[PDB]
């Protein structure tokens, strides 16, 4: 089976040459490996820290066991710095194994607002990265199933024109085999009372209001992790090799002629027991947004003000590890009546005004007047290096909000015996960083600082969104089932105002684990690390292709984006292969 095919001994590859080395066998890594190896003459080696997990059992395969895997060997559990918002360390869940974070995630399959992806071309100068182009790739990756009568009656709506049916990633309604909870329709009715839409297909381009959604699972409900979807069908390809249990530590650079060329990687599990393997064509970094930037830094590709004090020679000076964009999540949970019983998830994608309610005018005043101050402050905190280019990102967000009314927050509802919202401000203005703190890759000593709540509007937005989830949990049809709040519950007066919520929130949140931007795809002069083909600036035969690369957040779950971008980048790669045969 697949297990017997996987390599575990470094000696099997040490000193050898393949066409492409992919660091990280996660979402993008395996999708790309599969696409590239469709040409039998193209050799690919995937190097993954973890191992195969897809047949472990429900802790991986059942999405309703979400979270049980946290803390295990399948969770990197990356620790943040001591955060300035609350003087505590936070844990960033991140999948360790073939499939990466697809092994541990919530399976939610939704797309951004069209204006967000369009702006990657029109504001960030990434030619051809507009909604229509990327959506073509997303449709191609997708193998969606329409809902049945029961799933529709629960609240599903599926636009046949917005889903591919013949692709690779299996997606369809979550259905545990219970009856569906009326709470999902109750939430729809409550927001409909306030003029908010419902049942909009969150895969069509306008994610707004309260809807259900597909999940990344097979019809039989097995998790469609990236390994199950892209590796398991294809592992018998002799041109596709996968080494497990090893970390890529750095990219090997040959400094001929005017520019450095990536010629391979070093890999291992501890200093002093490493090996090299070489790439004839390219090295491709896909170790995740927390990790691929550090791999560049260990290699001498990063900021001189970071690398030099650590004793690393800066071979290419780039703002690697800046522009880190993760969201904050908080919880509102209530007990329900017995009549609320049943399965179901849904989410409110809430606009800026829906989020802020009566604070709207004031929040808009901040958005209109403080952008330059905020960018200056974020730059002074080391979240970004160029104030002008950050101000552009911020004017972009304010264009999204004011001229396109994009979803600003997400109130994610779970049912199955409670009414529980996990709530996050989708569009943080804060910018953080990740940087190495030692030169030994295998020590894994790094400062990952998302700078949660260090921008005032992010704290105000989060507070308003979480307050709104309490509000909506006991409004309209929701009052049919509401049987008392259990979180915050006694920890925060039920009549708390917005200031009281801003005081509570820094002590009651978690990372959302949606971190992007650490090797941003945008022009070099805007602070970018890669071009519109994901090539690292000033290095030949080196790409960063994973969640490090999106220059902005999106009002979406990211899988749809990341499978699309993997395939799009894979075409660019294959075009270069065909050009230099
Ligand atoms: C808890 C959680 C819940 C989520 N929920 C959802 C959801 O409901 N919907 C949705 O769309 N998205 C969700 N996501 C996001 C999505 O899962 C990730 O954004 C996506 O998997 C990232 O793709 P990637 O290829 O960038 O990195 P990953 O998929 O993280 O892959 C990176 C891979 O590299 C490996 N690795 C790390 N360091 C090294 C190294 N030095 N050498 C070799 N290999 C290395 C890792 O072990 C991992 O396998 C969630 C994420 C998390 C953590
Ligand atoms: C996380 O922990 C931090 C400490 O590790 C907290 O920071 C400290 O917070 C206290 C208040 O709780 C501040 O103390 C005040 O200091 C000012 C004057 O500050 C100025 O003078 C000193 C003297 O050299 C200088 O260090 C400062 O930078 C200022 O220039 C007094 O006027 C106050 O009455 C009070 O004493 C600390 O200054 C501050 N920083 C430290 C100790 O380095 C921080 O608030 C904690 N964060 C959270 C969310 O809890
Ligand atoms: C279905 O998708 C098509 C094509 O994008 C779009 O034209 C139409 O408005 C959608 N209808 C609904 C109700 O989503
Ligand atoms: C949002 O609220 C402001 C008032 O605070 C109003 O000027 C604006 O038109 C509203 N925007 C939308 C998209 O409804
Ligand atoms: C800073 O950003 C602006 C906007 O992108 C750009 O015009 C300028 O070239 C950048 N500064 C540097 C030093 O490149």
Q: What is the DSSP string of 472-489?
A: HHTSGGGGGTEEEEEESG
Ligand 3 atom closest to Cα of residue 159: 1
CA distances from 44 to 38, 39, 188, 333 (A): 11, 11, 48, 47
Give the ligand at the shortest distance from the Cα of 269.
Answer: 1
Count the neighbouring beta carbons within 10 Å of the beta carbon of residue 74. 22
Environment class of 549 (CB within 10 Å of its CB; exposed 0-12, middle 13-18, buried 19+):
buried
Tokens of 556: 């979406």
Please confirm whether the linkage preceding 257 is cis (ω < 30° from 0): yes
CA angle 206, 95, 318 (to 5 degrees): 75
Q: How remote is the CA of residue 197 from the centroid of ligand 3, in Å?
A: 15
- Give strand ranges (E) for 462-572: 482-487, 510-511, 542-544
Kindly give, in sequence order, each residue whose CB lies less than 8 Å from that of residue 283, ignoring residues fewer than 6 positions away: 20, 21, 23, 251, 262, 263, 264, 265, 541, 542, 543
Strand, helix or coil at 565?
A: helix
- Closest Cα to residue 101, out of 434, 564, 547? 547
Task: Please confirm, yes or no, whether 514 is among the known catalytic residues.
Answer: yes
Task: Please give the domain boundaries of the chain with CATH numbers for all domains.
Answer: 1-50+234-322+433-449+517-551+569-581 (3.50.50.60), 51-79+91-107+216-233 (4.10.450.10), 108-215+323-432+450-516+552-568 (3.30.560.10)
Max CA distance (Å), the chain: 72
Coil, strand or helix at 2 = helix
Q: How many whole angstroms separate alpha carbon 575 and alpha carbon 581?
A: 10
Q: Report the atom number in ligand 4 closest to the C-alpha of 352.
A: 1
Give buried/exposed letters for 267-280 (b at 16+ CB in 10 A, else e).
bbeeeeebbbbbbe
Q: Give yes or no for a contact between 2 and 231, defined as CB atoms under 8 angstroms apart.
A: yes
Strand bridging mode 274-285 / 17-23: parallel
Rounded CA separation 24/353 (Å) = 40
| Element (DSSP H or E) covering residue 248 | strand 247-254
Tell which atom from ligand 3 comes closest to the C-alpha of 200.
Answer: 14
> Hey, whose CA ends up nearest to atom 12 of ligand 5?
525
Q: Under a CB-based contact definition with an 8 Å cutoff, are residues 413 and 419 in contact?
A: yes
CA distance 26 to 566: 11
Residue found by looking up tokens 């890529």 in the block: 248
> Resolution in angstroms, to 1 decimal, for this deposition?
1.9
* CA separation for the pair 551, 533 (Å, rounded): 14
CB 133, CB 569: distance < 8 Å: no
Task: Please give the helix or strand (H or E) that residue 390 lies within, else none.
Answer: helix 387-404
- For atom 4 of ligand 5, the residue with the nearest CA is 389
Q: How many CB atoms lie within 10 A of CB 219?
A: 10
CB 291 within 8 Å of CB 297: no
- How far is the C-alpha of 192 from the C-alpha of 184, rounded, in Å? 12
Q: Which residues pair with 556 in a beta bridge?
A: none
**Residue 251 CA, ligand 5 centroid: distance in Å:** 28
* Nearest listed ligand to the Cα of residue 326: 1
The kind and range of the H/E element at 59 are helix 58-61
Nearest-5° Cα angle at 180, 178 to 183 = 140
Separation of alpha carbons 193 and 458, rounded Å: 27
With DSSP H G I counted as helix, E B as strand and the rest as coil, what are the percentages for the chain, rounded to 5? 35, 25, 45
Dihedral angle over CA of 429, 433, 434, 436, nearest 10? 180
Query: What is the distance in A from the centroid of ligand 2 to the CA of 21?
Result: 48
Residue 506 CA: nearest ligand 2 atom is 49
Q: Give Cα separations from 377 to 36, 96, 190, 278, 387 (angstroms).
A: 43, 35, 39, 43, 9
From the CA of 196, which ligand is nearest? 4
Enter the tokens of residue 276. Answer: 């090299």
- 335: CB partners within 8 A, 6+ apart: 418, 419, 482, 483, 484, 486
Residues linked to residue 169 through DSSP beta bridges, in sequence order: 142
Pocket of ligand 5 (CB under 6 A): 386, 388-389, 392, 525-526
Contact between 323 and 552 (Cβ < 8 Å): no
Check pocket membership of 449 for ligand 3, CB cut-off 6 A.
no
CB 446 within 8 A of CB 507: no
d(CA 455, CA 325): 12
Q: Where does 402-514 show beta strands of DSSP type E? A: 407-414, 419-425, 433-436, 446-449, 482-487, 510-511
Give the distance (Å) from ligand 5 centre to CA of residue 127: 19
Structure tokens at 135: 């959506």
The residue ranges of DSSP E strands in 215-321, in sequence order, are 240-243, 247-254, 261-268, 274-285, 301-302, 316-317
């Amino acid at each position: 089976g697949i297990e017997a095919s996987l390599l575990t001994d470094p000696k099997d590859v040490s000193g050898r040459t393949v066409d492409y080395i992919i660091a990280g066998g996660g979402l993008v890594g395996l999708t790309t490996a599969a696409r590239l190896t469709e040409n039998p003459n193209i050799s690919v080696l995937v190097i993954e820290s973890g191992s195969y997990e897809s047949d472990r059992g429900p802790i991986i395969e059942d999405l309703n066991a979400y979270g049980d895997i946290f803390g295990s060997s399948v969770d990197h559990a990356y620790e943040t710095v001591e955060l300035a918002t609350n003087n505590q360390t936070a844990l960033v869940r991140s999948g360790n194994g073939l499939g990466g974070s697809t092994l541990v995630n919530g399976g939610t399959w939704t797309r951004p607002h069209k204006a967000q992806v369009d702006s990657w071309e029109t504001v960030f100068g990434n030619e051809g990265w507009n909604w229509d182009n990327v959506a073509a790739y997303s449709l191609q990756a997708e193998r969606a199933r329409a809902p049945n009568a029961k799933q529709i009656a629960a609240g599903h709506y599926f636009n046949t024109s917005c889903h591919g049916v013949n692709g690779t990633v299996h997606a369809g309604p979550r259905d545990t085999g219970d009856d569906y909870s009326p709470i999902v329709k109750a939430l729809m009715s409550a927001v409909e009372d306030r003029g908010v839409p419902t049942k909009k297909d969150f895969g069509c381009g306008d994610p707004h209001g309260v809807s259900m959604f597909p999940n990344t699972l097979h019809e039989d409900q097995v998790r469609s992790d990236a390994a199950r979807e892209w590796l398991l069908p294809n592992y018998q390809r002799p041109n596709l090799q996968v080494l497990t249990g090893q970390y890529v530590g750095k990219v090997l650079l040959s400094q001929n002629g005017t520019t450095p060329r990536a010629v391979g990687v070093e890999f291992g599990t501890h200093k002093g027991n490493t090996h090299n393997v070489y790439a004839k064509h390219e090295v491709l970094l896909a170790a995740g947004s927390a990790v691929s930037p550090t791999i560049l830094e260990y290699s001498g590709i990063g900021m001189k003000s970071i690398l030099e004090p650590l004793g690393i020679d800066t071979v290419v000076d780039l703002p690697v590890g800046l522009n880190l964009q993760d969201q904050t999540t908080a919880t509102v949970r209530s007990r329900i009546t017995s009549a609320g019983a049943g399965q179901g998830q849904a989410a409110w994608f809430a606009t800026f005004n829906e989020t802020f309610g009566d604070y709207s005018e004031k929040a808009h005043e901040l958005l209109n007047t403080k952008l330059e101050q905020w960018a200056e402050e974020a730059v002074a905190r080391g979240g970004f290096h160029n104030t002008t280019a950050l101000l552009i990102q911020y004017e972009n967000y304010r264009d999204w909000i004011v001229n396109h009314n994009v979803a600003y927050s997400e109130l994610f509802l779970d049912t199955a015996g409670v009414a529980s919202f996990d709530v996050w401000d989708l569009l943080p203005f804060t910018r953080g960083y990740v940087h190495i703190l030692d030169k030994d890759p295998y020590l894994h000593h790094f400062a990952y600082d998302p700078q949660y709540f260090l921008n005032e509007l992010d704290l105000l937005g989060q507070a308003a969104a979480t307050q709104l989830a309490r509000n909506i949990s006991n409004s309209g049809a929701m009052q049919t089932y509401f049987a008392g709040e259990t979180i915050p519950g006694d920890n925060l007066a039920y009549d708390a105002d917005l200031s009281a919520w801003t005081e509570y929130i820094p002590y009651h949140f978690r990372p959302n684990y949606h971190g992007v931007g650490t090797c941003s795809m945008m022009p070099k002069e805007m602070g970018g690390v890669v071009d519109n083909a994901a090539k690292v600036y000033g290095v030949q035969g080196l790409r960063v292709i994973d969640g490090s690369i999106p220059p902005t957040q999106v009002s979406s779950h990211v899988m749809t984006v990341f499978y699309a971008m993997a395939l799009k980048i894979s075409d660019a790669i294959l075009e270069d292969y065909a050009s230099m045969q």
